[PDB]
Structures are given as structure tokens and as C-alpha cells.
Design a protein around this ligand. Structure first.
Ligand SMILES: Nc1nc2c(ncn2[C@H]2C[C@@H](COCCP(=O)(O)O)N(C(=O)CCP(=O)(O)O)C2)c(=O)[nH]1
Ligand SMILES: Nc1nc2c(ncn2[C@H]2C[C@@H](COCCP(=O)(O)O)N(C(=O)CCP(=O)(O)O)C2)c(=O)[nH]1
Ligand SMILES: [Mg+2]
Ligand SMILES: [Mg+2]
Lengths: 171, 180
């Protein structure tokens, strides 16, 4: 047993560890955008949330950004010309999605574009791509939780965990 | 009040979560004979309205603590739900025009059962009769932001549900006019 979850071989990042890492990222974002005079209504940071599972990351991250004085408005994948855009994704793997999203948003002429991902899987790149902000790295191993799914289940798990091979083989 | 844009805090984050844990226990009890399990038979969460991502993110994790596994779908600005149990989530229920349509549409697919859970219910806003099975907070006719709820797309990130200062929206409203 040892692992808290009967469906996981091991826990990689707890909810608390993820929030701690996300607070470190939020401090950097607060400093990086301090010369942008972000304000609710007049000038929020535009959060563009990409991929269905990212709703969890996105919910926690905007709240933490608020704790740090970075006000936001959210879009899920418009009116962004001259606004700062921060694309959120719960997992960066091949980078094919984020490359397409970033390139498409540039056509709307935002004042700036950066990306922030909860889980970077550098081993999966099919094109070169570096996110400006990375909460945590994961090696080659199939993880679920914190919004990340296996066949639509286990997104609600509060930690990022390694899915036990027996689960997806059988399924 | 620590928010300069708010008249006062109405529901703290902790109060919302406490109330959501009470609701979660009822849901775990209500569905306990449905044999919910991941993959095989999760509860299907249908999340409606853009601001509902915050409520939905917290609620599925809390339902997980209570042994209710889920999968999620979004309807903002459907799938294999026939024979499945469906719980529709919405951060605010007001006129009920949206939820009435979503539920009736979903019923055309003949789920095993369908219920609604809402974070904020404003009973005084109804334009048609509607009662959610599960209600985190019943709110009177005051204008609130936070916990997913916006004013012109801002303030969703506020961790509490707070009463917006009238000056904020009459000043912003006026400004939005100088632009049109
Ligand atoms: N759950 C999980 N998926 C993994 C893992 N390693 C790779 N994948 C792939 C599966 C596929 C679909 O994933 C949507 C998950 P959601 O965002 O809805 O939570 N991915 C992308 O599409 C990334 C966007 P990319 O950079 O590749 O374009 C990631 C892992 O360990 N765990
Ligand atoms: N922010 C805020 N909105 C309030 C309040 N009282 C009423 N409303 C309305 C405004 C309008 C659009 O709000 C989407 C917010 P989001 O879901 O994206 O978070 N509503 C609906 O459309 C409900 C769906 P209905 O039941 O009417 O069909 C709720 C309040 O106090 N505060
Ligand atoms: Mg997905
Ligand atoms: Mg909305």
C-alpha cells in the first residue's frame, strides 16, 4: 500500500507543494509585470486557459495571483489588443498546442504574451518550446491529478500522482 | 473591509468550503447506492457558465474527499450521458433561464438521473420556477463578485464572495459609455 491512493504507485507533488511552487511563480509574475500597472477593469492580466483539465490549475492560480496583487480576467480555449496575455496550461508535453495558441494570439496584437504551465514534461517535445513559467517538472511517467486525467477520470485528485500501470492496461 | 472595491465580505472562502463539505456529505449519501467509481461509472459533472470554473475546481476535489469520483464537462461561451448520473454545477442561479434549458436538454439524452448544485442561489431573481437540489448559499438581491463571479470580467479571482461598491460599477458603467 504505502501510497495513499490505491490507484497510484506514488505521489509526485502534493497540493501544498504545488501551491508553494505557485506562490514562488506568482511573486515572479508580480515583479515581472509591476511596470505594467495592472488594474481590475482598466487593465487586468488576460489569463488564457488552454485544455479542458486546466480549470483546476487556473482556478488556484488566479486566486494566488490575486493574493500577490496581480488582477486578472479569464478566457477558456477576442478583445486583447494592447493587453498583457498569460497563457495557462496544466501540462506542456509536445508543445504543439501551446505553439499554435501563442501564434494565433499574436495575430490579435496583445501588448505581450507569456506562458505558464503547471507540469512541464520536457521529454515530450516534438518542437522546441520553453514556457516562461513552470510550476513543476515531471519525468517520463504517466501522471494524473490536479486537473490531469486518465480517460476523463482522476482530474479531481488533489495531488499529482503516478498512475499505476495496472489501471490503464486493464482499461 | 480589506477589499477597496467592496462594501464588505459576505462569504469567506472558508465559509464557502465549509458549506461545500456539508453539501458533499449529502451527495455522497444520496448517491451511495449508485456504485460510483472512476472510469467505470463516475458522476458526470456538467459545469455551466464561465465563472463556474472556481466552484467546479473546488467542488470536484471536495467530492473526491468524500468518495464521490467525477468526470467533468463544460458549457460556457453532449457526450455519453445516457444511463449516467449527471450533476449540473453553476456558480450562480438567478433567473433560472439557463439551468432550465440545460437540464431539459440533458434530459433528452435520458441520463439515469440529473440534479443541480449551485454555489449562489438568488431566489428573488427567478423568471421561471426552479429549485436546485443542492445550494451552497442563498443570497438576497445584492450584487456580489468573487469566487468565480465577475463584474465586467474582473474580480473572479477574489477568494471571498463580496458585495461590490456601487461606486465601482456606476463609475465603470459611465466609463464604458465614454468609449461607445
Ligand atoms: N493526464 C496526463 N496526460 C499526458 C501525460 N503525458 C502526456 N500527456 C498527454 C495527453 C494529452 C492530452 O492531455 C490533456 C490533459 P488536460 O490538459 O485536459 O488535463 N496531452 C496534451 O495534449 C498536452 C498539450 P501539448 O504540449 O502536448 O500540445 C498531454 C501525463 O503524464 N498525464
Ligand atoms: N457577478 C454577479 N452576477 C449576478 C448577480 N445577480 C445576478 N447576476 C446575474 C448576472 C448574470 C451573468 O452572470 C454570469 C456570472 P458567471 O456565471 O460567469 O460567474 N447571471 C446569470 O446569467 C445567471 C444564470 P440565470 O439563472 O439568470 O439563467 C447572474 C450578482 O450578485 N453578481
Ligand atoms: Mg484535456
Ligand atoms: Mg459567465
Amino acid at each position: 500500500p504505502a501510497c495513499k491512493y490505491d490507484f497510484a504507485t506514488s505521489v509526485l507533488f502534493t497540493e501544498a507543494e504545488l501551491h508553494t511552487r505557485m506562490r514562488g511563480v506568482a511573486q515572479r509574475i508580480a515583479d515581472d509585470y509591476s511596470n505594467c500597472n495592472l488594474k481590475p477593469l482598466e487593465n487586468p492580466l488576460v489569463i488564457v486557459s488552454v485544455l479542458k483539465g486546466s480549470f483546476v490549475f487556473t482556478a488556484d492560480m488566479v486566486r494566488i495571483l490575486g493574493d500577490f496583487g496581480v488582477p486578472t480576467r479569464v478566457e477558456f480555449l477576442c478583445d486583447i489588443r494592447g493587453k498583457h496575455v498569460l497563457v495557462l496550461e496544466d501540462i506542456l508535453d509536445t508543445a504543439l498546442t501551446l505553439r499554435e495558441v501563442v501564434d494565433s494570439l499574436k495575430k490579435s496584437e496583445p501588448a505581450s504574451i507569456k506562458t505558464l504551465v503547471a507540469i512541464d514534461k520536457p521529454g515530450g517535445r516534438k518542437i522546441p518550446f520553453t514556457a516562461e513559467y513552470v510550476v513543476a517538472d515531471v519525468p517520463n511517467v504517466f501522471v494524473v491529478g490536479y486537473g490531469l486525467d486518465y480517460d476523463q477520470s482522476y482530474r479531481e485528485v488533489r495531488d499529482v500522482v503516478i498512475l499505476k500501470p495496472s489501471v490503464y492496461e486493464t482499461w
